[PDB]
RNA sequence: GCGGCCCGCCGUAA
RNA sequence: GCUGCAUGGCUGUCGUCAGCUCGUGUUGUGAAAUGUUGGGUUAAGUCCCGCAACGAGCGCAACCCUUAUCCUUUGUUGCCA
RNA sequence: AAGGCGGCCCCCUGGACGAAGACUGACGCUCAGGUGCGAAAGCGUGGGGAGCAAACAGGAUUAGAUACCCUGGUAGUCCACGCCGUAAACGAUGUCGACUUGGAGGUUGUGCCCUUGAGGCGUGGCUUCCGGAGCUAACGCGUUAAGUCGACCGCCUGGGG
RNA sequence: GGGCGUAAAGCGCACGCAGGCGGUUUGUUAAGUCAGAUGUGAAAUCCCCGGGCUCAACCUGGGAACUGCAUCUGAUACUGG
């Protein structure tokens, strides 16, 4: 808000013209974001998805870009929320009735952790079964027991996750995204201008969101 | 309660090393009583599967249109890639006069007194866009006044 | 001619036989002739009954016949009069004493021979081929099976060349021998020509 | 990086 | 006796070649494409990594027979330490 | 302006462009018919002829070779003065004027800040390549539009014939 | 109520008479332009409101139009002088 610990856009060379009114005059050939404008609608957007948490929003977080990949899971599971952090699959929301059976497969496999070698002690099956179970939970760790159709959705990087945003528009799911100077507002524009490729900024954003969502229920 | 119609079933072929493989495609339109309408095109290997595969995908995409007493007063003209269409409202007592696909669409849409003509190509798929052609851009008498910041009387004059 | 026959390749591993007995090289021919005569004679009149297979065994001194049917009521008829007539006529066929035993088919939509007979009898009376095989597959999968495949070929009412269609569900792996496949065939003397039917049922692996 | 080598009767499978 | 150019079954054939397809979802008005492609590997669509694909079926291998080493049960018509 | 233009030096001569200032006061845009300029080849008269090379002659290859390959070789290609008036004369896109998100460059004027240098703030002209909305049957075009408009002109109406 | 990049279609390129089009005002002008009224646009046909033949085709009564043309006056936003 006033701490001025958030960096700014990538570079005037790589800039999206659709973000003209969210910019400041460059002085070192690097775009500067307009923090005087980021704060108001950021808070007014925190408001409703704090209210949405009162309706069991079942919000998700996408941070599969290795800059905030470890940070998203920290804010995830804080109160109740969930996340995905490796290999966003294509259409697991639109094609949820198919990828659901993968969650069922994992829910059948992890029981065999209690008895998967004592039924039969063949060493060949153990290695590949373990690798298959580990692979299945690597991308479905935060979704291992969801019911489906999350109500809200939060995005770290817009263009890097344009597939998710496009998969959200068709189903009428509100979207909350951190948009840098290269991306553009296309989806459900609860736009959150700010530097996406900055660990300090993304951690601050995630902390603010996690604190905000916590009081949604109670 | 929803009204469904089947229009076209044509065989479509593809050639491979072993020879030619055939397929069937069907185009169907689904409409409500008074304003909801949608269409679906579905590939399949057999005709009944094509029908049962186009029906549900036509059911999902329903779009609403504003109309009063089986019409709405607007001289609307619709354009697409290859086909060009034009329709205007009728007074009363007149039935529905239009082409083949146009007849089905205007019938299940809810309109009961309209006049229409089809120009250009007569392929059913492009003219099926008669819905998207004008009905999507159909204008509401009170919405014009609302966006102009006036009441309905002054707009009517 | 492309496919080896599933039954023969599994006869000794995961399949029983239809006539298990012993006879030296001298009496092989007459024994086989008697077997064939009895089998065909029984199959003639019992066509109305849902006869699946006939088993013949010779305990080195006698002839015994086993009949598998889902409809024992007509198989025996009102009472033992039908069975007594069959036993006496087969004793006329083979002078050695004969015993008749009746088995039970619990699932008529199993026993690929039975479903083949049902579908060919349906096709006998001028019904389009799609519905019959479709409903047969629906019934087969409804009762629980890990695979099903049906084949039909011949003059399907058109003067053009004979075509061939097949619908399949589940797994029917014929290259694995432990898997048990119920495969049989039948034909109908249709007006336009003889039409053959083939059915495969994968009940499950035998370990 | 450079030698050369021609033709295939009329209609036909839904 | 006529009709394989009306037909069931039965064979040859490319070829024991490693390919051939489907369900759902996304891409184009459309025929269609994706999956089945790219990096590396296998006898092999055999596998690993990456990827709008996620999974499935026939296929591949295996489960069959015989043979290559010894272990147990038993010695006639078969063996002679 | 289009066809097109290349060693160096001199003589005559045309156009565009930039910065600034002064002046005239709508004197403008497009044009049926008319007028002029148009690559290569070709024609006429008089000169010239190194190299190359239609026609032509031998030698090869080939079933045959009239050709592709080799050895020769006249017209022509060159100059002066006159004709001819056609080219895939193609960006296969007619000439003017106005409006519409970006970029990377190249070449050529000009201004202000340490001009220290090759820094950056710009600011006109013409050019090259990607690309959004939009348009298109698609391919694609996209401020040098095939996007949104106005003025004038020239052409089109199934394939052969 | 069509088109000219690849389906038919932009003259090889320029100059330019007659023609078509005209930046921004100020005042006159009433030419075009807009509003009236006056006279015609015969009859016959068509429409409308009706009638008589057993309704009906057939005939008849009245209104509508006869989209134009001519004259006088008014309007001066726009184009023209």
A few lines on this structure:
It is classed as ribosome. This is part of a larger assembly, with chains A (218 residues), B (157 residues) and C (207 residues). Chain A is built from 6 helices and 7 strands.
Tally of extended strands of chain A? 7
The helix content of chain B is 25-40%
**Cα end-to-end separation of chain B:** 39 Å
- The oligomeric status of these chains comes to part of a larger assembly
Q: Please write the CATH class name of the largest domain in chain B.
A: Alpha Beta
Q: What's the gyration radius of chain A in Å?
A: 20 Å
Order of helices and strands of chain A: EEHEHEHHEHEEH
Spatial strand arrangement across the major sheet of chain A: 4-3-5-6-7
CATH overall fold name of the largest domain in chain B: Ribosomal Protein S5, domain 2
Order of helices and strands of chain B: EEEHEEEEHEHHHH
Percent helix of chain A, as a range, is 25-40%
Per DSSP, the total helix count of chain A is: 6
Compute the number of helices of chain B. Answer: 6
First-last Cα distance of chain A: 26 Å
Could you say what the CATH topology of the domain at 96-140 in chain A is called?
Answer: Helix Hairpins
Structural class of the helices, strands and pairings of chain A?
Answer: alpha/beta
* Largest sheet: spatial strand order of chain B: 1-2-3-4
CATH class of the domain at 96-140 in chain A: Mainly Alpha
Based on CA inertia axes, which overall geometry of chain A fits? elongated
Query: What's the number of domains of chain B?
Result: 2
Structure, described:
The structure is cut from a larger assembly and holds chains A (218 residues), B (157 residues) and C (207 residues). Chain A has 218 residues and is an alpha/beta fold. Chain A contains 6 helices and 7 strands; from the N terminus they run E-E-H-E-H-E-H-H-E-H-E-E-H. Chain A has helices at 35-53, 69-75, 96-109, 123-139, 162-169, 199-217, and strands at 23-24, 32-33, 60-62, 82-84, 154-155, 176-179, 190-193. In chain A, strands 4-3-5-6-7 form a 5-stranded parallel beta sheet. Chain A starts with 22 loop residues before the first strand and ends with a helix. With 157 residues, chain B is α+β, with helices and mostly antiparallel strands. Chain B has 2 domains: 3-63, Double Stranded RNA Binding Domain (2-Layer Sandwich), CATH 3.30.160.20; 64-148, Ribosomal Protein S5, domain 2, CATH 3.30.230. Chain B contains 6 helices and 8 strands. In chain B, strand 2 and strand 3 (36-44) form a beta hairpin. Chain C is α+β, with helices and mostly antiparallel strands and 207 residues long. Chain C has 5 helices and 7 strands; from the N terminus they run αββααβααββββ. Chain C has helices spanning 28-45, 72-76, 81-93, 112-124, 129-142; strands spanning 51-57, 63-69, 98-104, 147-154, 163-170, 179-189, 194-205. In chain C, 19% of the residues are buried. Chain C binds 4 RNA strands through residues 1-2, 9-10, 12-13, 153-155, 158-162, 168-179, 185, 187, 192-196, 205.
């Amino acid at each position: 808000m006033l701490k001025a610990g958030v960096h700014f856009g990538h570079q005037t060379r790589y800039w999206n013209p659709k973000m003209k009114p969210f910019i400041f005059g460059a002085r070192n050939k690097v775009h500067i974001i307009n923090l005087e404008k980021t704060v108001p609608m950021f808070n007014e957007a925190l408001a409703e998805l704090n209210k949405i948490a009162s309706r069991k929003g079942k919000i998700l977080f996408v941070g599969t870009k290795r800059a905030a990949s470890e940070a998203v899971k920290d804010a995830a599971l804080s109160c109740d929320q969930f996340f995905v952090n490796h290999r966003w699959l294509g259409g697991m929301l639109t094609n949820w009735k198919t990828v659901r059976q993968s969650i069922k497969r994992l829910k059948d496999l992890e029981t065999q952790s209690q008895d998967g070698t004592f039924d039969k002690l063949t060493k060949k099956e153990a290695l590949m079964r373990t690798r298959e179970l580990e692979k299945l939970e690597n991308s479905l760790g935060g979704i291992k027991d969801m019911g489906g159709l999350p109500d809200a959705l939060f995005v770290i990087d817009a263009d890097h996750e344009h597939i998710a945003i496009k998969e959200a528009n068709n189903l009428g799911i509100p979207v909350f995204a951190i948009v840098d100077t290269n991306s553009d507002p296309d989806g459900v524009d609860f736009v959150i201008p700010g530097n996406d490729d900055a660990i300090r900024a993304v951690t601050l954003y995630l902390g603010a969101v996690a604190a905000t969502v916590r009081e949604g229920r109670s | 309660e929803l009204q469904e119609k089947l229009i076209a079933v044509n065989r479509v072929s593809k050639t491979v090393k072993g020879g030619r493989i055939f397929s069937f495609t069907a185009l169907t339109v689904v409409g409500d009583g008074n304003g909801r309408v949608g269409f679906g095109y579905g590939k399949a290997r057999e005709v009944p599967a094509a029908i049962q595969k186009a029906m549900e995908k036509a059911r999902r995409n329903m779009i609403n249109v504003a109309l009063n007493n089986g019409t709405l007063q607007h001289p609307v003209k619709g354009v697409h890639t290859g086909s060009r269409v034009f329709m205007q409202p009728a007074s009363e007592g007149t039935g529905i006069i239009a082409g083949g696909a146009m007849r089905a669409v205007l019938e299940v849409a809810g309109v009961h007194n309209v006049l229409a003509k089809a120009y250009g190509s007569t392929n059913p798929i492009n003219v099926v866009r008669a819905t998207i052609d004008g009905l999507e851009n159909m204008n509401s008498p009170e919405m014009v006044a609302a966006k102009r910041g006036k009441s309905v009387e002054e707009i009517l004059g | 001619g492309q496919k080896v026959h599933p039954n023969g390749i599994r006869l000794g591993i995961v399949k029983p036989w239809n006539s298990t007995w012993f006879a030296n090289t001298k009496e092989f021919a007459d024994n086989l002739d008697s077997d064939f005569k009895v089998r065909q004679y029984l199959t003639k009149e019992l066509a109305k009954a849902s006869v699946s297979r006939i088993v013949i065994e010779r305990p080195a001194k006698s002839i015994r016949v086993t009949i598998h049917t889902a409809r024992p009521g007509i198989v025996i008829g009102k009472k033992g009069e039908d069975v007594e007539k069959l036993r006496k006529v087969v004793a006329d066929i083979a002078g050695v004493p004969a015993q008749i035993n009746i088995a039970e088919v619990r699932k008529p939509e199993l026993d690929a021979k039975l479903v083949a007979d049902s579908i060919t009898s349906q096709l006998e009376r001028r019904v389009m081929f799609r519905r019959a095989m479709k409903r047969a597959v629906q019934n087969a999968m409804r009762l629980g099976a890990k695979g099903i495949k049906v084949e039909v070929s011949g003059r399907l009412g058109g003067a053009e060349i004979a075509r061939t269609e097949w619908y399949r569900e589940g797994r029917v792996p014929l290259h694995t021998l432990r898997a048990d496949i119920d495969y049989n065939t039948s034909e109908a003397h249709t007006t336009y020509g003889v039409i053959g039917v083939k059915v495969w049922i994968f009940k499950g692996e035998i370990l």
